[PDB]
Amino acid sequence: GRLAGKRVLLTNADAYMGEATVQVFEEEGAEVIADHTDLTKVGAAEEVVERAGHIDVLVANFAVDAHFGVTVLETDEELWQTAYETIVHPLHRICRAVLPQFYERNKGKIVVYGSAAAMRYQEGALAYSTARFAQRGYVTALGPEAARHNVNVNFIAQHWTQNKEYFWPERIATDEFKEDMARRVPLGRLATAREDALLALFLASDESDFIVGKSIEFDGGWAT
Amino acid sequence: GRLAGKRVLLTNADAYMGEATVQVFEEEGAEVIADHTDLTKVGAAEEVVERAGHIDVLVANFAVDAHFGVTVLETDEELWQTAYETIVHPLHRICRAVLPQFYERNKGKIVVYGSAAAMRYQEGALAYSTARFAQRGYVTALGPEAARHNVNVNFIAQHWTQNKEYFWPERIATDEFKEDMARRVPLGRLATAREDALLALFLASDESDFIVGKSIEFDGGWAT
Amino acid sequence: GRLAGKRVLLTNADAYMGEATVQVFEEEGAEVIADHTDLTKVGAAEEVVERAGHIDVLVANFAVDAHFGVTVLETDEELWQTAYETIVHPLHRICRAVLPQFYERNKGKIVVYGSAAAMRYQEGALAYSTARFAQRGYVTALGPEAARHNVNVNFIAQHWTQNKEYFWPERIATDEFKEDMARRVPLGRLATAREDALLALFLASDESDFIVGKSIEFDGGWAT
Amino acid sequence: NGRLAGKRVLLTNADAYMGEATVQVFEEEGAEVIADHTDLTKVGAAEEVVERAGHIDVLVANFAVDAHFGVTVLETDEELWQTAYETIVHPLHRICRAVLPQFYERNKGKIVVYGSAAAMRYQEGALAYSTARFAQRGYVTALGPEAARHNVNVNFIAQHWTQNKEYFWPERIATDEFKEDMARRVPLGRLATAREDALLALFLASDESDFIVGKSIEFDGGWAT
Numbered sequence A, B, C: 001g002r003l004a005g006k007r008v009l010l011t012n013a014d015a016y017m018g019e020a021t022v023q024v025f026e027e028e029g030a031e032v033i034a035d036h037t038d039l040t041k042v043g044a045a046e047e048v049v050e051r052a053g054h055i056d057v058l059v060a061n062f063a064v065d066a067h068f069g070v071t072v073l074e075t076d077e078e079l080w081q082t083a084y085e086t087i088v089h090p091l092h093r094i095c096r097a098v099l100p101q102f103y104e105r106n107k108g109k110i111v112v113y114g115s116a117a118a119m120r121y122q123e124g125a126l127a128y129s130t131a132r133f134a135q136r137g138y139v140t141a142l143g144p145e146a147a148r149h150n151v152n153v154n155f156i157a158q159h160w161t162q163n164k165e166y167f168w169p170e171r172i173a174t175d176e177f178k179e180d181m182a183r184r185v186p187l188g189r190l191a192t193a194r195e196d197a198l199l200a201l202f203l204a205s206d207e208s209d210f211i212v213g214k215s216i217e218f219d220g221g222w223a224t
Numbered sequence D: 001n002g003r004l005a006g007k008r009v010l011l012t013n014a015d016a017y018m019g020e021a022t023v024q025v026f027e028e029e030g031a032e033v034i035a036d037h038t039d040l041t042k043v044g045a046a047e048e049v050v051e052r053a054g055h056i057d058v059l060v061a062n063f064a065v066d067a068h069f070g071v072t073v074l075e076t077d078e079e080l081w082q083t084a085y086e087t088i089v090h091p092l093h094r095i096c097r098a099v100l101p102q103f104y105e106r107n108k109g110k111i112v113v114y115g116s117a118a119a120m121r122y123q124e125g126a127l128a129y130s131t132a133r134f135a136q137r138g139y140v141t142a143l144g145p146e147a148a149r150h151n152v153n154v155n156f157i158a159q160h161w162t163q164n165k166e167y168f169w170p171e172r173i174a175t176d177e178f179k180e181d182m183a184r185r186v187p188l189g190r191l192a193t194a195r196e197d198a199l200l201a202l203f204l205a206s207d208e209s210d211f212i213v214g215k216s217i218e219f220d221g222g223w224a225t
């Protein structure tokens, strides 16, 4: 097993990419703590880790409505703030909580399921895009700092990937979605959740200790 | 006069890069509304703009203490939130407020004084770096949306530039800061505030209409 | 004049972006040496610079047929070699020929007219794309080495800009071209040659001394 | 069983650069590796390597040339400049162009290029070399999305600070000067072993990476971050 003997902490395990992570990571021998705690609440992250015990890998799995099609002028205070409360501030909270034990053992792995909208313009997703950009920046600024304690932190800039929040069955069925994907995605298809978790498995494994603070675009060529 | 006839709204005119902006923009024939409002408060942004009246150019000039040297574990909730409350959330409030008149005229200019820390890793500046990454994301996401209305939105990714909040006289006088800069900046010197303002000037002028949602690194070669 | 008292060497001055560089640069006070030498020949570049005498600015102006639509399998040896012989190998020859006198004075400016196909995937332009990437790497690698001597080397990553080689009047006059351009270019128009030269002007001027080895995307937001 | 079970891999210049770790890692994982030693700077050579090789599922484009560390722009003469391109740029297209027809026939293929982080960010004192690596990166960026329409993956490993004889031979890395540069410039604070580089290439060559198209993955301990 490529994660044999590892204990993995997965945030919001029922949302976004959690289901495929559990399935892939367990079949590679990991013990996956599938947490369901709302990490927008101050203090919650410190407790999840406390109750978790020994963590080898943190899979920071956060998602929020992109509000596709909402314009800049329609991006009101609540919508803007909710993007940050939901995927930005919790990211630092939960990473801060795991790092002490990582630093104790001079070893650790963090994988962030982010978005290729943090790499390049995605139309109609303003507040959301800026929040993923901030996630991306967290990995860019933390990666090399944590690398000094032999901790890897990396960012999956995913897009066109099966999940409820962004590519739900109703959306991907329309003629309009299929024409737009064909124009914009060179590979011409969506990724499966499993393919996403296979990249994360690499980034969570000890096969990837030399990858630090990087954004790997998981997008079928979209941002190329 | 390269800004002849233009009116310019400058945020936090006394902080960060405001002084050099007034100097250079006024020399090129612009009226500069030098604002000192605390755009942290909901509603302030809209009222600066109503009072300002006609605006051809918004210079979004925001700054927060980088808290140099503060590590990830020492980056507490207050410090983290302050970075976003000070330079991220207000940026969208003020850009949302001027865009309506830009869209009526099908013309507009937005210049964001940002950070090269939004482009690449800057040691000991975690919270701040993620916040600058949010600003960069805002320019990347908004730029192409606004450009359909002939509105230019761009990002100056500056570093190693004279200002009080990051390169104040006491910090840059040490013999050993000079050695560090000399290793990290290929040009081997700090930029003057004025040089930064001459880049903002180009981006604010109608000489730069084809520049859309870009991050121009203004850093002596640091991130190259 | 913003180039008052400057002498500018412009390669292939009757091709690509030369005409507009002469007009804009002469308007700003510069003497423009409009060279037509075939710099694909060894020894030519050194002779040109010897004839030119005192140079403050080099505008590396090279272009080659992109063979739009030719695929990887039909990109034969001769087509591949020609792209490098035309725009890659000559670039090093003329910059190497100019740098000695810049190093004596510890001052110089090099502006490269490049392509946004050096930044992002451009359909059906394989050999040409890789040659522009090479140009971009030359700016990226030389930039910081030349900046030690207070010399600026920068790259204009242009696209959707009027010129005979890539956007000649016939090609851009059809309704099909305009509809594709409207989809791919957020600003929704081509740039004028003059607008391109106004960015070169900024990068050739002493207002841009802090810009080192950078690629500035001049593409209506295409690559954003 | 193996992550490349049943796959036939064509590896160029198998004794140079990252070739040896590639053989070892890929074969541990069930691959049959065709370890080519042909000089692909000769026109027509790439086509013959592919024909003589039979069925190919993965091409590992493994090319290196002397970086000429420390050689200045003014010292970069015609022959040095030309040699960097003749050695790692021109053959890259020759060998990919030669293998793609059978990939396109089967609507399936993998290409992994061992490149350089010098193709991503400024690396001191390696001018001609850096621009040749930049051209490799551009090849992947431009070919990547084109080949992806035929279900072929082309990706670029932008490696630095990684075991090899061309760029980290023993005399170079023994000096105090080099050890202090690395500690300052490499967040992880060490060099990679060739095995670790090959494990990334393993991922990119496997069918676990079908969704990675024309990308540059930085394998540099954080140097370019």
Ligand SMILES: N#CCC(O)CC#N
Binding pocket: A066, A114, A115, A116, A117, A122, A125, A158, A159, A160, A161, A162, A163, A166
């Ligand atoms: N899948 C996924 C991430 C989402 O950001 C894509 C978009 N827009």
Ligand SMILES: N#CCC(O)CC#N
Binding pocket: B066, B114, B115, B116, B117, B122, B125, B158, B159, B160, B161, B162, B163, B166
């Ligand atoms: N000058 C300036 C902006 C600051 O972000 C640089 C740093 N660190």
Ligand SMILES: N#CCC(O)CC#N
Binding pocket: C066, C114, C115, C116, C117, C122, C125, C158, C159, C160, C161, C162, C163, C166, C167
């Ligand atoms: N104009 C121009 C540069 C050209 O390379 C754009 C394309 N394709």
Ligand SMILES: N#CCC(O)CC#N
Binding pocket: D065, D066, D067, D165, D166, D167, D169
């Ligand atoms: N190729 C290569 C590297 C070599 O030229 C330097 C040594 N030892």
Ligand SMILES: N#CCC(O)CC#N
Binding pocket: D067, D115, D116, D117, D118, D123, D126, D159, D160, D161, D162, D163, D164, D167
């Ligand atoms: N500079 C440098 C090293 C890189 O070019 C390849 C490796 N390893």
